[PDB]
Amino acid sequence: VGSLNCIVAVSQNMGIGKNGDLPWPPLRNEFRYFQRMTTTSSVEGKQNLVIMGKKTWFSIPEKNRPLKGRINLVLSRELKEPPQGAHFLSRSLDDALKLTEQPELANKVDMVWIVGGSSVYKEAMNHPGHLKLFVTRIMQDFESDTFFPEIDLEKYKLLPEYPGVLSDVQEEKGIKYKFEVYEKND
Numbered sequence: 001v002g003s004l005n006c007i008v009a010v011s012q013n014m015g016i017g018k019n020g021d022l023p024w025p026p027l028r029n030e031f032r033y034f035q036r037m038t039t040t041s042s043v044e045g046k047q048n049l050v051i052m053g054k055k056t057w058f059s060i061p062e063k064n065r066p067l068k069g070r071i072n073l074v075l076s077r078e079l080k081e082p083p084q085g086a087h088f089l090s091r092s093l094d095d096a097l098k099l100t101e102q103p104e105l106a107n108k109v110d111m112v113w114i115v116g117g118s119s120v121y122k123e124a125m126n127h128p129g130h131l132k133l134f135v136t137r138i139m140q141d142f143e144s145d146t147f148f149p150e151i152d153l154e155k156y157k158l159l160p161e162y163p164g165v166l167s168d169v170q171e172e173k174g175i176k177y178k179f180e181v182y183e184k185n186d
């Protein structure tokens with residue numbers, strides 16, 4: 001795997017979760033952006049892979065699991081087999097990426113997307129080589145119990161724009177937010 005993508009939405013106080021759900025009310029177009037970015041592949045015969053922690057898996061509504069049109073891989077040190085509805089299970093991020101080149105998946109995966117939680121983001125963001133971070137900045141404070149790790153500008157550049165990503169401030173349900181893309185190459 002020559003590149004990884006992370007995607008996250010974060011409040012001004014760096015919050016990503018509260019009580020097993022999001023800290024803010026549902027933002028429909030923001031969710032549609034997460035869906036569009038994690039699902040879209042123009043490579044015939046392949047699908048994207050989403051990698052997530054166990055708590056993040058159980059935070060997805062049951063009727064929406066597995067995330068449609070994507071190969072769903074959960075990370076856990078405890079489980080014997082993937083949680084019901086998931087496609088694959090790995091004991092670490094390293095193992096997950098290695099699984100993509102075994103026969104079952106060799107001819108099958110396009111882009112890899114890391115979708116949380118905190119521990120999964122931290123490790124991915126230090127992983128060697130090319131990595132993009134798609135960060136939605138929710139422009140308000142929200143009470144939270146789960147937080148996004150700091151972005152090290154020694155390694156990451158904020159890109160001025162990005163094809164297919166809106167540049168202007170967005171608003172839904174009276175809450176302002178903006179889409180950012182960060183990149184590192186080494």
Ligand SMILES: NC(=O)C1=CN([C@@H]2O[C@H](COP(=O)(O)OP(=O)(O)OC[C@H]3O[C@@H](n4cnc5c(N)ncnc54)[C@H](OP(=O)(O)O)[C@@H]3O)[C@@H](O)[C@H]2O)C=CC1
Pocket residue numbers: 007008009010015016017018019020021022052053054055056057059075076077078079090091092093115116117118119120123146
């Ligand atoms: N705003 C946003 O963009 C997002 C928000 N969320 C929110 O964040 C919260 C969930 O995140 P969080 O609490 O961080 O939990 P995680 O999703 O990271 O899940 C924790 C569990 O996942 C497993 N796990 C995590 N990392 C690894 C690893 N490297 N190797 C093996 N297993 C691993 C472990 O399971 P085990 O104990 O079985 O070993 C661990 O106990 C929820 O509130 C959710 O709604 C989540 C993602 C993004």
Ligand SMILES: Nc1nc(=O)c2nc(CNc3ccc(C(=O)N[C@@H](CCC(=O)O)C(=O)O)cc3)cnc2[nH]1
Pocket residue numbers: 007008009028030031032034035056059060061064067068115116136
């Ligand atoms: N940018 C961004 N926003 C998020 O809300 C977000 N959430 C998570 C973790 N939580 C979740 C919770 C629910 C679904 C979910 O049901 N997604 C469906 C439907 C999206 C929709 O309702 O339109 C999907 O098909 O992707 C995904 C991730 C990870 N990265 C994110 N990244």
